[PDB]
Amino acid sequence: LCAIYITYAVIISVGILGNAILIKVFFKTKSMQTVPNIFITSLAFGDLLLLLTCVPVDATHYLAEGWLFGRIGCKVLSFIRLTSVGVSVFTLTILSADRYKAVVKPLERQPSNAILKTCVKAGCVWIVSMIFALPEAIFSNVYTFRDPNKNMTFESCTSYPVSKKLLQEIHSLLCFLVFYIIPLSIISVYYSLIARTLYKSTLNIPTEEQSHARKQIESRKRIARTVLVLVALFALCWLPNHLLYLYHSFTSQTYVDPSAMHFIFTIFSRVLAFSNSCVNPFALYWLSKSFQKHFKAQL
């Protein structure tokens, strides 16, 4: 309607399509159901939920006068969205750790076909996400805010009541420290170590081999650059929304809303906050070669 909803809809559609094809490949193509791949598909699920929980959340924030799903509606929606975001971040950092352990320490490969271990790890990650989301779920609620420009009230979600603004702030900070600082730092260090190891391997592997080793060298350099750009995209996508939420929590302006140009900014952040969800599948699509083959096959 405002020339921006179309871009958000297209992003959500492409992300849903990517994640759906990814899960369909993981299920149908059993050959790709190895030990680590579980984690990968887990992320997709999270992403799916996020996307499946992103359509309504925004659909009610824009092109609407006030909240629609009600009190329990906002409760469950915020709970599931925060759980999906936490699961996504945790699975991303776990995949980074696994790639680090496999590339930097290739001789320490764990036992294969141990699907039970990865399943228990994913279950623990999901449980930790749900536990860390329970606070906002129990404290979230729909409240009315006044608008002096309109001289009327409008209902909207709030992770905490206005009477405990400070509390909210603290939570927000914690969320940041738990969703941006430590995850970004660990992913960055792991990807840097992986890229350094890949470069040292490309330098160590025989380069004189006639058109047989240079191909692997180029592939290793390409995947190293991809891994290095992954963390950059993750940061550029999760910094805008984090700063937006920090501003909203530190301000917590009640009975008044600054309806300035800020609108575009926040929604822009949202788009970026979702771009990463679409980058994770395609990222993998860029890593391997036969992966693209069976992806286009199932697609």
Partner: peptide, 9 residues
């Protein structure tokens, strides 16, 4: 507004 003034994601 509900785009306005709160809530993560």
């Amino acid at each position: 507004x509900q785009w306005a003034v709160x809530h993560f994601l």
